Amino acid sequence: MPQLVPFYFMNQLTYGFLLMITLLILFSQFFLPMILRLYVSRLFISKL
Amino acid sequence: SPLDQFEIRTLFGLQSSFIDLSCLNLTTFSLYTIIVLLVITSLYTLTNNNNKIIGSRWLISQEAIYDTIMNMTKGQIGGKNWGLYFPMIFTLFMFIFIANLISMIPYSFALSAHLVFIISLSIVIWLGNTILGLYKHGWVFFSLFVPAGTPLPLVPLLVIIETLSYFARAISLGLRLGSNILAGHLLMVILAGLTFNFMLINLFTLVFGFVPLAMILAIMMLEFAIGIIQGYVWAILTASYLKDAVYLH
Amino acid sequence: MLKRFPTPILKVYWPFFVAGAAVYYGMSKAADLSSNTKEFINDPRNPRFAKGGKFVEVD
Amino acid sequence: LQFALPHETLYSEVTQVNLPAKSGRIGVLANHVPTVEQLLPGVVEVMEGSNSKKFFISGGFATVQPDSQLCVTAIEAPLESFSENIKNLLAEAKKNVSSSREAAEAAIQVEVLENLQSV
Amino acid sequence: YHFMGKAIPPHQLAIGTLGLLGLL
Amino acid sequence: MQLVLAAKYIGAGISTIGLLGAGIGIAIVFAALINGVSRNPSIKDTVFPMAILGFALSEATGLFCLMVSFLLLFG
């Protein structure tokens, strides 16, 4: 198919893997533990 | 040409003659990756009202996604250490889930329907299973290729057409998602192209020309389902594959 | 705002990154091999024209 | 031999039995598959070559045996030479009670009753 | 845990078939 | 270009056959729906959205074979 075979392969793959490493570091260090802080806080007020 | 919606156009531009710096430059694909990153950033940064415990109505969505992917990867790899592979099993979800809702917006563009990126991501996850399996379990990694207690005179056949299914796994996982997103978008654009030329003939067709419009509305209702289900099926197969690679059956 | 937590993301995910570099390199060579075919040797937005050479144009 | 009420036990050799099982009517025969089924509140019949004799019943259990003996057990039970106005006047009081745990028992009466009407 | 010809029980047998079809 | 346009019509004819999959498919889903309601009439509002979901997901595979015929007729 003509449209998914251009010269832009390295473009696609470069910004894609930059976004993957970005979201991986970003999710893992920032955004998943900001939910888990809510979890441990709710359970800590629940246990008291 | 109903497939012109996937054209990649360069916007901001950069070139040289010393070094090929044309790899990185802001492009339609690249701009929609920036948009995906800013949406995923927006779903967690300004969602949380002033770091409140109670977790306002927006945060219930990103609560439920978290919980339905924790309770999914606990029921697949489920061993001594399942949580060490949980950020990857979540960030493989959210990219595909957001990049298949952004693509539903009418004048927009499917990141997921580029086979060269998704097949590359699938081959990355497959080699990262084989290397991890070899590192963790030595030469006995190949014990994955014999199923169970089997009769020995038919074991090498059941090894050959087990390994063939083992490296079909490299491209199948990506090409499933690519085929679903590409076929859905091409279906919607072709039916829109047919109902447009249906409604430009004689004025009796704009009367009772509501039923093909309703059929296109029904297909758009179907297309969110076929877009979210694939985002879930990616994250269930690359949990099962880490079960096979980490734990030998 | 957000407190960064030092999660281990390198002593867990190294073969994914090694595989990423390998697929990056292999797709680089695949792109260079595909950018010189008969169909795509006269598409003017390829990075050949930005450095030196011009128009083989014998097919 | 094998077909018993607690107060009165009935039958003994059989060529065809018809029963009102848990899921729809069934018919045991000369050699049949070993089975247990809840017996719904409905008619039954015995056979001895070409002999027609139908009973009603309350419900219970049937059990086809590997040794081939069929055992049928119910509580209360001749056909129309047993059970119209006796049914009618009772059906009245039945439906009445339903509109009332207590009225739930009357629900049981409507289905059991409605069935008997057909005989 | 196979037993071929009452010998030492072989490891998993999977590498030898791949080695046989590799040299072809 | 008469040969390729004659081949377009034959290709649109061949790409009609895949609809029989959906034609048997929707039916197997609704047949299981009927045989599930008859075994248990209380589970209707739990089971019937899954039947609608299976209807949609098989009708998608039907339309994926219809769209190839619509390409080969006109596009």
Added chain:
Amino acid sequence: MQLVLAAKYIGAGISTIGLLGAGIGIAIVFAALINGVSRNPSIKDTVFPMAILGFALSEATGLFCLMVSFLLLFG
């Protein structure tokens, strides 16, 4: 042109094979309806609208086939 037209007749012939899916399928739906009434007769009024719904939705994928057949006849 005869070569295009004859192939259009052939494609119209080929297309109608997919209607056997609907022909088997409508009957599978009604057969499950019959086997469902025979287990519980008090559920017929509930189940029969979904049986005729399954008839309609399975006739749909046969009439798409028939639509492609007529578009390879009169267009």
Added chain:
Amino acid sequence: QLVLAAKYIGAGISTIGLLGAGIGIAIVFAALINGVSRNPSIKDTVFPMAILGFALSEATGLFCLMVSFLLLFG
């Protein structure tokens, strides 16, 4: 002439769909038999549904049959 020959070829092709009716009518009558044999008291209720299913599956076959006749004559 090639077109009249292609008419007869396509008329031959379009009768394949009649096997759909030829199998499906039997599935309906089979469920009919297995319903009457399980419950004889529901026969008069069930039998018009079997007649209706026969008629509708006959119509689905007859669509292929009339496309075959249109390729024959019209």
Added chain:
Amino acid sequence: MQLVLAAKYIGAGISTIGLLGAGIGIAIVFAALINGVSRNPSIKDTVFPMAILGFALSEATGLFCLMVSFLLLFG
């Protein structure tokens, strides 16, 4: 003419594929008949005319293909 007669013979060969529908269907009818007699022995006289009717109707739906092939051979 020769090319036309050749195509008539090809189509007459094609047309008898649909007879397998009747060949399988008469069997499903008689097989359910056998299972119904073996399930309930007393219902034979009630059930048997429905099976005869089903044989006749399914044989006619098969015979439609046979008479189309007869039309291709002679008419």
Added chain:
Amino acid sequence: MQLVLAAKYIGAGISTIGLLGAGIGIAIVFAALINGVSRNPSIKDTVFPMAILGFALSEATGLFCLMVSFLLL
């Protein structure tokens, strides 16, 4: 006639596909036969004439395809 004699043999090759209907159907008939006799042995002499009838009619439906293929030869 060269092409016509070729098409005769092509059509005679095509015409034998319909025998699979009988080849499966005789098995469905005798399968329900075996299942019914094994379920209840006493009904065997009642049921077995219906099985012979089913074999006869299904073999007749196969014989239709066979005689069509013979008409092309």
Added chain:
Amino acid sequence: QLVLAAKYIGAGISTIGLLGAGIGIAIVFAALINGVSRNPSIKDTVFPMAILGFALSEATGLFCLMVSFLLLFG
């Protein structure tokens, strides 16, 4: 020399009908195994009719084989 080509083509086509017999032998012996495993004592009663239908359903595919052999030389 084209009848020699289309002759071998149609003789190749005539082998498709053997799948009916290949599945039919299986349905017959499947019912046999089900009946024996459900009722062990009925083996000698059930067996000869199963062999009968086995041979006849084999003969049905052997019709396809004999039309193939009749096409191959003749």
Added chain:
Amino acid sequence: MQLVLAAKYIGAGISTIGLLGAGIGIAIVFAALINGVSRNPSIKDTVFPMAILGFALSEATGLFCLMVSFLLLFG
């Protein structure tokens, strides 16, 4: 040059028959899902991931055939 595009479109038409192997696939999976939920109402939250898994992991084999069709049509 017309022959290449002609056989290209014919092969792209042929390579959509495999979707009838996916419509029936999704059908049988959701049919077993319905029959499994109906006969045990407390198994839904255990059987539903296996349902979605079997659904898409069976379609994939029809979507491979559709990608062969797309590489024929447009490549």
Added chain:
Amino acid sequence: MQLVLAAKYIGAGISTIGLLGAGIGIAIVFAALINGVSRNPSIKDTVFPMAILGFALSEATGLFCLMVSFLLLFG
């Protein structure tokens, strides 16, 4: 000549389609075998030779399919 040498190879390509009959037949035989052994364990010594007997001539029908391909592939 090339016209019959092509037809040899095409007929050999045709004649392997009948192998699906054996490929499903061995499955139905061993499927009922597995159902019987799992239903009644102690009947295995009687049941298993019947399954081998069915497999033998079902695979022989597969070889009957395959031998015409061998006959037409080499003359």
Added chain:
Amino acid sequence: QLVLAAKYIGAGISTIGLLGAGIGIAIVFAALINGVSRNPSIKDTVFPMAILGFALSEATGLFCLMVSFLLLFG
């Protein structure tokens, strides 16, 4: 270049074999769903058999896809 066009017909026809693969994965997971729903305590016992049977059935559908890729690219 008749061969360059006729390899595309072969790549189209050789993709039909996935019809069996899709129905196959369906029948495997259908039996898995029925087996879990009848016996709720068998999932962790019999689920690797289901994944095994799926892997075997796909690979034996995948033969057709690799033959299609050899015809289309070799």
Added chain:
Amino acid sequence: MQLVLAAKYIGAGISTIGLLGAGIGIAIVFAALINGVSRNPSIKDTVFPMAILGFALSEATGLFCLMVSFLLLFG
């Protein structure tokens, strides 16, 4: 030899049609395997090697079919 070289590839395409029977067959074998172990958990060690036996014995047909495909493609 362009005609014979094209018929090589056409025959290699039409050869693997019958290979879908193995894909259905492995599934029917393992389907009865799951269905049998679901009734009796304690019959696994007898039935499972019998299941892989039926697997390979049904696999042999599809492998012979693929073998004839490679013979037509490579000689």
